[PDB]
Design an enzyme around this catalytic site. Structure first.
Site, mmCIF file in Angstrom:
data_model
loop_
_atom_site.group_PDB
_atom_site.id
_atom_site.type_symbol
_atom_site.label_atom_id
_atom_site.label_comp_id
_atom_site.label_asym_id
_atom_site.label_seq_id
_atom_site.Cartn_x
_atom_site.Cartn_y
_atom_site.Cartn_z
ATOM 1 N N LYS A 218 2.389 10.422 4.063
ATOM 2 C CA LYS A 218 2.562 9.132 4.690
ATOM 3 C C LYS A 218 3.765 8.343 4.160
ATOM 4 C CE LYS A 218 -2.547 9.176 5.209
ATOM 5 N NZ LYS A 218 -3.652 8.227 5.420
ATOM 6 N N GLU B 30 7.103 -7.247 1.597
ATOM 7 C CA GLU B 30 5.893 -6.863 2.343
ATOM 8 C C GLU B 30 4.882 -8.033 2.327
ATOM 9 O OE1 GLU B 30 4.925 -4.556 4.202
ATOM 10 O OE2 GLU B 30 6.418 -2.972 4.130
ATOM 11 N N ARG C 95 -10.098 10.843 0.652
ATOM 12 C CA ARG C 95 -9.902 11.713 1.770
ATOM 13 C C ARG C 95 -11.066 12.747 1.912
ATOM 14 N NH1 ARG C 95 -3.185 11.780 1.059
ATOM 15 N NH2 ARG C 95 -2.893 9.646 1.792
ATOM 16 N N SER D 97 -10.164 5.589 -5.158
ATOM 17 C CA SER D 97 -10.994 6.764 -5.460
ATOM 18 C C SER D 97 -10.467 7.579 -6.640
ATOM 19 C CB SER D 97 -11.119 7.666 -4.233
ATOM 20 O OG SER D 97 -9.843 8.061 -3.763
ATOM 21 N N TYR E 32 -15.202 1.105 -6.599
ATOM 22 C CA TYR E 32 -16.409 1.931 -6.542
ATOM 23 C C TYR E 32 -17.330 1.707 -7.751
ATOM 24 C CZ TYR E 32 -13.420 3.952 -2.970
ATOM 25 O OH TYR E 32 -12.604 4.095 -1.881
ATOM 26 N N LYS F 28 -2.323 -1.847 -3.495
ATOM 27 C CA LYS F 28 -3.117 -0.637 -3.475
ATOM 28 C C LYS F 28 -2.237 0.523 -3.940
ATOM 29 C CE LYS F 28 -6.155 2.304 -0.698
ATOM 30 N NZ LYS F 28 -6.852 2.256 0.591
ATOM 31 N N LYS G 67 0.836 -1.174 0.000
ATOM 32 C CA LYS G 67 0.000 0.000 0.000
ATOM 33 C C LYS G 67 0.880 1.235 0.000
ATOM 34 C CE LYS G 67 -3.678 2.603 1.986
ATOM 35 N NZ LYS G 67 -4.286 3.058 3.248
#
Ligand SMILES: [Cl-]
Ligand SMILES: [Cl-]
Ligand SMILES: [Cl-]
Ligand SMILES: [Cl-]
Ligand SMILES: [Cl-]
Ligand SMILES: [Cl-]
Ligand SMILES: [K+]
Ligand SMILES: [K+]
Ligand SMILES: [K+]
Ligand SMILES: [K+]
Ligand SMILES: [K+]
Ligand SMILES: [K+]
Ligand SMILES: [Mg+2]
Ligand SMILES: [Mg+2]
Ligand SMILES: [Mg+2]
Ligand SMILES: [Mg+2]
Ligand SMILES: [Mg+2]
Ligand SMILES: [Mg+2]
Lengths: 333, 330, 333, 330, 333, 330
Positions: F224, F240, F214, F281, F319, F255, F204
């Site tokens: 981040k 990971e 957000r 998104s 979505y 992601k 991610k």
């Protein structure tokens, strides 16, 4: 690779390093004299020995002097020499006709060595750079570009004059596309069935050739010119595999990576992928840089065999090295 | 892995490199050197003794003083290591194999004597109970005649420790008990024998080729298929080696040698670890017999040893080690 | 390979070894009679049986004696014989013309066996060594070198005379470059569509051929001569892959590694890399060495099936072995 | 892995892409950027001091104030990290190497000074005992002159902790003791130094190329073949790296550099982890000497550094880092 | 891949993420200007600049305007342009003859750029879609099917007119079988030895080409037609390997995956399997979708370099992107 | 792996299979089905509420009653699972993120309501602190503003447990703290939540593509890069995933989605485990925006989703799931 779950302290890799005897038992690679090729710079005339300031301890030698030095090279067990003629200035031309002169230095030196030392391997150089007024490895078009297929026509004539002189091995260093198959075809057609082609397959557009260009006398001819349109980009690794794959397909008996130590990863990949007789050139700049540091007292003599062991470890079968006498001597003892 | 690269006759003629000695030497893929050689030696209890062995022509059992004398010649030739195999007196055999960990057993004595007079010479002791049991089985038997695994490991550990105390740089468990490499490594580490190497006999087949060795060591008074490997099995040898590496072996060995070159090759390819191979008494005798009979030229000895290097072995335990070492010096 | 984290004592590999039944269940390879090829030495004349001192228990046999012995070879289920003629001294020549004589021993023995035992596979030997005064596998030039392409001309004529005699399989053991494709082409051209070529692909310049050279009578012809210019260097493994790759490309139906036990790693690599019908020769020196140790009481008879199981385990599909009768008999029971 | 795809001259002419600068740039497989560069620096005890080093032309030992001054230029060029090598005063050397964990040792002082004035600059400390021992050996010696493994690790751990306390973002153990990466990681985690990176010198060869560095640091008053790697060994480097990854290293390093590019390549191919390479003092001096002598054009410096990227290195420790960083800005 | 038993908390992958400097040290890939190809839409006439509503910020440019804009493209260091001519409606035909017109926009624009900017790489488009009344990339048969080999005849004439105009690179986007080898052969025959062929190898029958079809003016010609009989099925991955393998065999110097971001797995597989110069097109719909989201305030500008870094990470060597100026500018700073 | 098999034009014409619909369907390598679809949903605190989101055209935040109403249509279409993302009221945010484990937090309420009315519908809860912190950071901050790893894991564990208590069949930690998958798995097993799946957000990236989300969740009041992955890194994603599998994840996720298809492909090829991908998104909005603008035909939606299947994903968080599910029913 399978790590097999080896873990400290059950696995301590220093145990094999504890003693010389275990060190020796597990030691993965060794250099021997069977791995050594000595390149030699060959002068015209008689009784000529010339120091090379950028390659300390290396001498250009006339053919008579070369025959005398070769007595010990053979006694030391060195399998082969790679000959690099030092072309007289007056014999350089646009058309490089001296390349295929049956009385050129390369051809004369071959005939003399083949007769005097029948078991010694003679590797001739197939390339026009010692013969062109511009110092480039082929024939130029009107844009000053090295013509591919026209150059191969001349390289073929050269390779044939080398076979005719008795050279067991021809080594095209020119980096023209398709020249291995063209030279192979011509050798076959002419009945030179057993003449090996040692392809300079992955030969890089390197800055490490300086001293050699002084040694063969091509440096003043080349000037500021470069070979980036044919010699390989230093940054490129995958591309070396394509180069070698084609030279194998085209009939090469041996394939070579050039420069050596700055391209050991290429040696590794070429051996791993093709499983073919693999060669590496420890070039003049590699030699000069070690010799200069040793003479200055900055490195121990022992870097010589360290540099050469690297080639074995990386996957090379044979090493063209100006150190080949020193190494054979140290082996030897 | 492997790409033919479209190589095709007549552009490709693989005989060109074969045309001359110089090009054959240049492309020659492998070379045997004395760095690859380990000499196994059969060791007697007495002084001033040598004995000949009928099934091993040219091999002598030596008492420890003779061993020291001969080792001068082995050291001079550059042989890196010996592998010691004691010839146990009949009085010293028992059901408990206690002689295995006797600080004055032949292996232990030989080791101290060797470590003192030739401190650079590698000594590889044998970790196994077959020279010490009355039935010579490589471990302790239960009441159905079965070689007990974990109970045998307890004795093998005591034995390996006694070798480490005697100064051995390498202990080589040849017993084929499950888990012994780990138990020996654990005990060595707990006792502070941090640098003692363990050379696992990892893929050690239930072979017919050990016959002459059994005469050599005096164990010849029965089979070992419940612990030694089935000759037919290859994939199995990978599991055996993986475990021995995980358990802490410093080198891994395939036994027999030439009848198992494919196993050497798989073991080296898959694990990339120090790989050893034993050219066993039966291999030695077959070759030696044929040479003496005039059937085979003596160059078959270097050919066999060269085969080990090509198959991927780093080191070879071989009764030919002195002969090969002399051919490599000459 | 994936070790899958197997660890003692959860994994104890002796559990499967506990009992014969589990041993049998997991046993990875088995020798059967379908894996066996019997080589046979074939004498001229009638009623001839000759012991071979360096191959105890093996006999040279005239064609009449061979037909009688073959009754049991077939009854035992042995799939094929490989014929090796014992050339009369007077029939050896520079040009090896006896190789393609329709009345040569090989050709006569084929015709006789094909008629008597229609289901038995007959593999003929394509090589000049039993026919040359010098004992080398091809025709020499004035330097005493075995000529490649000139030898293939004769080998082709031989292969054709074998097909004409009814041989289902021809096995070129000669180690000339390109001979598989030349022989394949000729067989195809001549309508011998189904004649298999069993290539001796990775055939080493070995010291283990001694007894066979006594058996075929080529030893005195060869003398101290060697085959290092064509047979492969024992030290070379990667090179075997190139050999096999070319023979497959050239049309071989089967590919063979020779010697057997001293080259099991080659068998393994050839099977692994090519996935093709793979054959191995357990040569005369391998046979002599086991038989000599068994007769001396130094090894148990059981080494025979141990040596043969090794070939299966290593990756061979079929094994040319002088032990093939003994083995079939032991199988059998 | 690799498929020739039947590419054949003249349909394939590998020189077409070489014909012009624009197509060479498009296909160009690797590129050196200042993101790849780590500058090693030799640090003096005094103030207002610089010293020249005979075997390292153009390299200066700097006292910490000079280091701060020079670092302004290194930071401006975008050099991500320094690797600090203290030049220990003779009075500070001992058999116990206690100066290694001295909160006011040169490395510790340099680190605090750097972390405070250039908080974004990476500081990589050296975890090793060779600048602190009277015999300079990388660990504590036993009575036969052998470098003790676990006892040395105890001192290395104290040392690594002192570096983490001084603010170092990365500690780099160069000592080649077995198991040290794990012991250091354990101690860092127990002490709450959760984010301190460990850059393992994983495959660090018993090389002749370190000669000039030994003059640089003053350790030149002996060999390290019982702990540093045999130059001949390649498969071995895979085992060394596998262990260091399992033990918690955040990056793994091959040392020497150019004489070991094949090792960089195998290490990156097999582990796909952050891979570092040290272009050592001997490499630097050889190149530097030849350039100054007029034997080699100075473009050999970028050629050597480009070789590291192509062989698979993510980061290069190199005495050329300032010079290369300036060529990349110009 | 070998996980090497890495386990939390001994392995915490956030340690390298702690600081910018460690981030930078281990960062696996970077975009540079050497990775950038700018496609440009080229209008006929003089002093013409036309906005494209579906590609905000992109303009169609007449050749004079293109020469001025190119001054900065070159100053920014962008290696090459890919030219897409905007064919006048009246020049569209059944036979697509304008494709090989020496006075066609593509040919005129090449000659002008090659003379003005000799170092700038010019990549021409080999395809009939800008020239056909039906908007399909080749010649139709009476069933309305795009004829393969007949189309290649026209594509060859086009490629030759591009070489004749001085284009260093021709890029067949047409997706006819065998066209790489046909175009290669013709270029070779005609002495255009060094003209690179950038094959659109794995070019998908995609819905992401909408804006470009508006930009070149082919959208109204195509109508509701589709290219599923030649462009590749989006669902197919293994099939891309066969496509590329053939184009390499046929002589391509570079191989391209098209669309870009929706096919990054294809880029990855093509690089991994072939190790050849690999190219990717970030197509007009990819560009429009990012630009529309950025203009709406829905995404930060930073997605641009994120989208382009993805191509490097996936294995591309070069990226045809309408963002190439913006990117070069951001690089640059 | 891959063998070209010497396929050559004109014997090979890859267009023959493309000639007709029937042969394209036969050879068609991958197919999207509703089995591949997960619908993420933004959940409000109130009753009878829906809100539109400016950067996510066509997406509504729903209060839990509206969610239940809409879920009738999602269940009917055969959508296997929802992924819930609570829109936390401003009053409920804190430095300690306690609302994360509130048995009456929106996620927990939504889950109980869903599990009761649609017991066969999969509910995937979000394990992360970004909807609950005043600064929305995915964990607890220390005094330098750094997201504390292990301290955040303590809160994430409490959160995951509360989801398991609420009835969630799957908890999906999206926080990118090191070691969290293992800590959550341990706590789930200790509490007897044996069958609760953990869907790790394993690889991610520190992406610019999350902007619209957000706004959706109200976290938009900062980067981040100390925990989310550097976009440039690929080899890293393998490490990971390896860790998350070892730590007990039942499925692993990449992601962003389409900008990372190469990562999906490597993750599936190397691990052969249940592989998930989030079409985020930003992907949704880019596509949706271009379609509404008339720039792209709406078939780009199935093309994007088809790309996930081809790259190796088993399941897609998208979505678009309702729209795609309707196209697959029609
Ligand atoms: Cl010849
Ligand atoms: Cl010890
Ligand atoms: Cl037939
Ligand atoms: Cl920390
Ligand atoms: Cl051209
Ligand atoms: Cl549960
Ligand atoms: K060699
Ligand atoms: K060795
Ligand atoms: K079975
Ligand atoms: K880097
Ligand atoms: K590039
Ligand atoms: K189908
Ligand atoms: Mg080439
Ligand atoms: Mg075992
Ligand atoms: Mg052959
Ligand atoms: Mg280590
Ligand atoms: Mg195609
Ligand atoms: Mg993680």
């Amino acid at each position: 690779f399978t790590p097999a779950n080896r873990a400290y302290p059950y696995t301590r890799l220093r145990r094999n390093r504890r003693d010389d005897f275990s060190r020796r038992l597990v030691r993965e690679n060794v250099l021997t004299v069977d791995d050594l090729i000595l390149p030699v710079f060959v002068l015209d005339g008689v009784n000529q020995r010339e120091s090379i300031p950028s390659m300390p301890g290396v001498e250009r030698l006339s053919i008579d002097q070369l025959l005398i030095e070769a007595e010990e090279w053979v006694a030391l067990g060195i399998p082969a020499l790679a000959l690099f003629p030092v072309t007289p200035v007056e014999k350089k031309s646009l058309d490089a006709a001296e390349a295929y002169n049956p009385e050129g230095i390369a051809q004369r030196a071959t005939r003399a060595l083949r007769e005097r030392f029948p078991e010694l391997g003679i590797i001739t150089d197939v390339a026009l750079d010692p013969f062109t007024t511009h110092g480039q490895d082929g024939i130029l078009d009107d844009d000053g570009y090295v013509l591919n297929d026209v150059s191969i026509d001349v390289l073929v004539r050269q390779a044939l004059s080398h076979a005719e002189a008795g050279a067991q091995v021809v080594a095209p260093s020119d980096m023209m596309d398709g020249r291995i198959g063209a030279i192979r075809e011509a050798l076959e057609s002419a009945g030179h069935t057993n003449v090996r082609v040692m392809a300079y397959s992955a030969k890089y557009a390197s800055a490490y050739y300086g001293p050699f260009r002084d040694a063969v006398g091509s440096a003043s001819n080349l000037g500021k010119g470069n070979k980036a349109t044919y010699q390989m980009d230093p940054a490129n690794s995958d591309e070396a595999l394509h180069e070698v794959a084609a030279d194998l397909a085209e009939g090469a008996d041996m394939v070579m990576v050039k420069p050596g130590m700055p391209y050991l990863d290429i040696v590794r990949r070429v051996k791993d992928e093709f499983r073919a007789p693999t060669f590496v050139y420890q070039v003049s700049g590699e030699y000069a840089m070690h010799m200069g540091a040793i003479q200055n007292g900055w490195l121990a003599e022992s870097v010589i065999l360290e540099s050469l062991t690297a080639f074995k470890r990386a996957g090379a079968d044979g090493i063209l090295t100006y150190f080949a006498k020193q190494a054979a001597e140290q082996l030897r003892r």
